[PDB]
Design an enzyme around this catalytic site. Sequence first.
Site, PDB file in Angstrom:
ATOM      1  CB  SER A   1      -1.021  -0.056   1.146  1.00  0.00           C
ATOM      2  OG  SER A   1      -1.928   1.047   1.123  1.00  0.00           O
TER       3      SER A   1
ATOM      4  CG  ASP B   1      -2.965   4.625  -1.680  1.00  0.00           C
ATOM      5  OD1 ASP B   1      -3.446   4.446  -2.822  1.00  0.00           O
ATOM      6  OD2 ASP B   1      -3.168   3.846  -0.704  1.00  0.00           O
TER       7      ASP B   1
ATOM      8  CG  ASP C   1      -2.517  -0.090  -2.761  1.00  0.00           C
ATOM      9  OD1 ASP C   1      -3.094  -1.104  -2.281  1.00  0.00           O
ATOM     10  OD2 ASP C   1      -2.664   1.053  -2.288  1.00  0.00           O
TER      11      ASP C   1
ATOM     12  CG  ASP D   1      -6.382   1.122  -1.842  1.00  0.00           C
ATOM     13  OD1 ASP D   1      -5.621   2.062  -1.486  1.00  0.00           O
ATOM     14  OD2 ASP D   1      -6.329  -0.059  -1.354  1.00  0.00           O
TER      15      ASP D   1
ATOM     16  CD  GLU E   1     -12.026   3.168   5.232  1.00  0.00           C
ATOM     17  OE1 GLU E   1     -11.472   3.049   6.352  1.00  0.00           O
ATOM     18  OE2 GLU E   1     -11.709   2.450   4.248  1.00  0.00           O
TER      19      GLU E   1
ATOM     20  CB  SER F   1      -8.210   6.057   4.791  1.00  0.00           C
ATOM     21  OG  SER F   1      -9.128   5.492   3.830  1.00  0.00           O
TER      22      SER F   1
HETATM   23 MG   LIG Z   1      -3.699   1.817  -0.554  1.00  0.00          MG
END
Ligand SMILES: [Mg+2]
Length: 459
Positions: free
Chosen positions: A104, A238, A240, A242, A321, A323
């Site tokens: 990630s 980010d 990866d 997502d 989220e 995040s």
């Molecule tokens: Mg990620």
Amino acid sequence: KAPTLPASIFRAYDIRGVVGDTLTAETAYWIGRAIGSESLARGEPCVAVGRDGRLSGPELVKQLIQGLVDCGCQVSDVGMVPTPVLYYAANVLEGKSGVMLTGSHNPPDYNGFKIVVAGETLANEQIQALRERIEKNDLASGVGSVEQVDILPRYFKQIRDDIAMAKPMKVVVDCGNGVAGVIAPQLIEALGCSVIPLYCEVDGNFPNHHPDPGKPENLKDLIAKVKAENADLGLAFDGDGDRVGVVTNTGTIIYPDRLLMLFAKDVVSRNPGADIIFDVKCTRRLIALISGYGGRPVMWKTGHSLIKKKMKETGALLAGEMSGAVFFKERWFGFDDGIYSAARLLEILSQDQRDSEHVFSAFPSDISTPEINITVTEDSKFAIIEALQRDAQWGEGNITTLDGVRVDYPKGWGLVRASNTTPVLVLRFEADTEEELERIKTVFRNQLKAVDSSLPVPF
Ligand SMILES: [Mg+2]
């Protein structure tokens, strides 16, 4: 007969470890064996496999694949792709199972696994079950297959076909040398934008800034470039892919709960009464905003697998989220996808004559603290939360204990929760006035001190 693996790499929403330390080649093989066994037990022999741009990738993935094959699984190897592209493979190929080899946004030496088995994103007891499978040697044996699948062009086409931009836009795209560089800039250009690339070369050394747009220091270069080039928007992915971070033409950081306001308005406009999910860290304004447009707001727990589970249980059309993970089910598949979310954001913005600064600034804005962190100890962190849950007094506040303790008042709210990975209590507060903010901070200060009068309370 399998070796003993470190229990500690089997986490709540993934498997994660340090390569050549807690995560070796042998470790990856037995993880593959465990996943393939679980997939076969749910009636699914067909498993997609993807990897991010990390240095350990091309070779740890071999062990993961051999582990699946040695169960008798039919593996579709999609090569190096973003995480949501692997999730996409596990929705459009023969099988509904997929494994993503990713670390990630972590430093270069980390890698790990995100796992979907027969449509379900694993969490918690399901991940500990894989560990228990290896410990018990409760594992399938078979002679599987591997097929190479080139899925990136199909994903690219699926999004381009769905999105309709109305005006051209100039966009700075910062991939942080992560895997999003394989598609995000090309896709955004193809939508009808001019793209100014930042750190778009895939490089698992991460020689620039780590691809973690959750930390504002990692957005400095993006903000500088947006202003310098008079661009309409800046996007940061980010490692990866997502998660996505957004900055306006004037360099304003747009947090994920405010981004979700724009998306919620859009999705609910076409879908009266749709459920919209957000986590406990998101602004109370989002509750009212979803309600006012005729949606059903649903607050839930943090954690990608838990959001996706709740999506399926509620029929929700959208989730987000704090995040930066945004989960579209409307016109899409329900998984977290920064690339698709960027595309959906560009679609909406391209339809408004105002600049991105003014589109976002029009939403209600309260007085909010930044995220407050209190280092406690590993021994005490959960017990402090439990003591609050047992004995704290909050007046007429509406109490949510889904994930720590959140208290909603008519004109503001507060949250305290224990970090899952560090010995730290994490807090946020907001209110519509300074006076109300001080009142809310005071209730939380008093309730923490009632637990332990010696706790540092830096607010
Ligand atoms: Mg990620």
